[PDB]
Amino acid sequence: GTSNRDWWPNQLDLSILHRHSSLSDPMGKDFNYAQAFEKLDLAAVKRDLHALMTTSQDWWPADFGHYGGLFIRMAWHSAGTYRTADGRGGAGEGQQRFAPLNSWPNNANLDKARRLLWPIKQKYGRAISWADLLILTGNVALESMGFKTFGFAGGRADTWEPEDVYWGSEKIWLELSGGPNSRYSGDRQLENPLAAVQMGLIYVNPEGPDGNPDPVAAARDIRDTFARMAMNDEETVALIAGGHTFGKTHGAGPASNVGAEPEAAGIEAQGLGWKSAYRTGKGADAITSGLEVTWTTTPTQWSHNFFENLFGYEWELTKSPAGAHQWVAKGADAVIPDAFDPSKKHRPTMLTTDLSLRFDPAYEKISRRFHENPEQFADAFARAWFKLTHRDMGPRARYLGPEVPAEVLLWQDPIPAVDHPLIDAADAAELKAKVLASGLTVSQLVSTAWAAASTFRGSDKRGGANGARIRLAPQKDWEANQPEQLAAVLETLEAIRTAFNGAQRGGKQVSLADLIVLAGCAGVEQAAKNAGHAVTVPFAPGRADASQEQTDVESMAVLEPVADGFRNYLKGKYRVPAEVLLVDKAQLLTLSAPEMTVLLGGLRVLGANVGQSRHGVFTAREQALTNDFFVNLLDMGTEWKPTAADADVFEGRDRATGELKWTGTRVDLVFGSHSQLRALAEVYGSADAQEKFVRDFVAVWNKVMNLDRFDLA
Template structure:
């Protein structure tokens, strides 16, 4: 609405006086209600019958030439030009006896004048049934886009058609038995893949999950497809090596009566790597594994849509794609939040993964241990060691050296995503717990719990 100039309109809800009770946008123009309302400043309707589904919008858009005018509030809008035929008037929103000229905004006219959108709009105008179908599909996508895959849908009205924006994944054809799992674990151990390669690949696959719209995750093994297999953060050369090894194991296992998906093998590989790293540190653990993932095809993967999932930063792998206004530690917290991790879960995962050499570029930044490749709490012990002093070694203050306080000998190098666990008071409190001499068993248990949570973030078939 735009009944009068915006000078009559009050402040926004958060800026209004306390006695206005956040109603905001209050107007001192006449009654301030109904015909006297001021909101966007635009005044009028687009069609002759605004409450009826018809082609009135396109009829008006293409049926008239339009000229620029202003609403009573002074907002720019367009009205039909008198060019030889009657103009169908639109009903007033508040006075039944009153009729108004239809109006359009500049964005509306772009659907007519733009060289790309114009032909699309004309096609819809000439083919009402096609327009109705396209609108229904677009509306369904708009209102269901953040619900995740079809596994999250309930009720009898779920369409049978599978749509590519739902990120379809074929169901697993065979349920792995415990004996199968142990056989596959043995084959992975003998594959020659390192702890770092196995753990990094599993993390890269699962950590794409976004709790905001339930997209991404390990199910589907789309890390072996475009665009994910080419992302810099995934170290494409190393990733290709791991996938080829796992495909070889898959080929040797699959038969007419049984099969395993690459998606399951990737996650199982991460479990094998962690168990191997714990054993090397003198601890015997078992990482929970729940099979049942499927493998998506390239045809089932919208490359453009999945490109939007590429992380601009992943502090768990000490990766930042470029220079941003946000700091590395802020982006780390944002990434953890997308994966629905708590602060303690984020903390223990960082500590464990640093020791397992999961940096995207295989650098030693944040690897505060002499026992690399083993699952230990050394990251926390050495980060909080008071015998170490830290100093920035880059002008951007994103890389630091830790030196022995007495000898000045360089001991470690770390990034902001590492040092934040000693700098931030809350994160330091968690780090101090895991740095304790008697916390090794707690560290292992918490790390495995958080790891398993990430691996199963997209397993909606297990929820409930």
């Protein structure tokens, strides 16, 4: 059946905004996963998982009699899709069980690992999500094999459909770079927001870059991709050597024996894939990656034998039984046990990417320190494994259960505890009146609160107004945030704050984070009053102020808005059209298409544009909250044409006289072009819509202000 996507393959796709409706969710509207999890007997779950580790099933026999390595790989892959550029991927939604990730080639035979967990999932039901269970299972694997983990938090609610994520433009699985849809350009520059080297890989190619078995060059890909997953050199070496302390790879015969991935398999395979024609198709005969490497002399026990081997031998290039490049220890004895035959032993082997840890000079120094000091290795690996598996969980307030680590980590963008009474409704009214009396304008107040709150992204639940990090480096100097204007607003608000807090007794105080949001609320109320309408904008106090020392400036860089259609802002010229970047931002903000539309039309008339640009300011009463954006956009009395100077800016002229009325960008005019967005604009641009527009705007404004408020959940 030919679809709209077939006919108009470049039109904008709004369905990414309308995933995760209550229609597709089997749980009731009132289901609360946190409440279910908090009553889970987590210790009982862990005992069952511990038993599972050595209870082999004949349809996928356990290597060495222990599933621990398989499950560590499973949990690593669950977390390993994460990209810092947009926060998408990661373990936090349990997306490994859906397309496409369930069928990525790098996830081969993890379908078996997930199937092994069904009995436990079935026993505990809604009290433990798949998302939490995948990570917990990796922790229990580690613990069962003698490794002390740093901790665990539950709270990853399950999702019920695939996320819409850009994973690359290639049309062939694992396509080597330089094809018509190459994700590389220039001197091996990987396109943002991607964090893997080939379509269907987690980070890098275990043979080397595009299959070339050079550990030094592989190291460059490792470093780049791991940085794009928020890991530095120390963390990267800890993770790779830690993981590859356990288990083995699978490449017992040629890869042509392996059939369809799960999404392509027959209905009779019942959700499994990669069925192999090679001998028994499993166990001793398994083929997963096509490599055949077992790293340590005790693959089911924590050790420091990975580094002992890495440094204690020299390495020779060889081929697996599937023909993949890998390495074997020169002159070594057969000291590595076989996974099924207790009469057989093997020489030590390594991947190209394992040898990167010795032959890249910066890695080598870390690896040597870990080799000489395995206690340092263990601690770094535990910390990095926690970070890996929790990176997308959001604020520590979301962390559930009895194993949450008490240590507060810089990468968590921590928010201090509140230790004092909060302002009440009367205090909030007093503060709003003081803000408005200071002379701060509607545009200032709205723009500042928008800047503070709209860094949130639901993909990894980073950002938002909590913390008042807009006053700190680097947010205070982001171009989109208008640094000089921002500085002036913050100085005025801080003076109001100081005066209010100095007059209190009893320890009541207001944070700057709360006052920035409250001041924005005052701006929206005043805009409504300018339009002839009395409204109260909801406000919830309880945000706290983070310090500079509690803020990782490098990690905060990825939250810079380089495109923010809600402020008609584009930092430079991109290949992706601006309207597509608007929809991407709306998806990060968790907005529906109606929410996006209302919010944008209101912001335009409130003065939220960066640089006080007139683009899209389709009103003669700026700083009044009206539906003028929609009424004027949809007026057929105005004709629109791209300018000569800039094809992405349009002039709106009176159709009869030629008089110039307005200018607008693609982000403005898409609302009058796209047939679904125009239908939404029409509702808000109708003669009966003033009250609806104001109410819906206040609601979406309050939603955005509260995106990071997991303390109120």
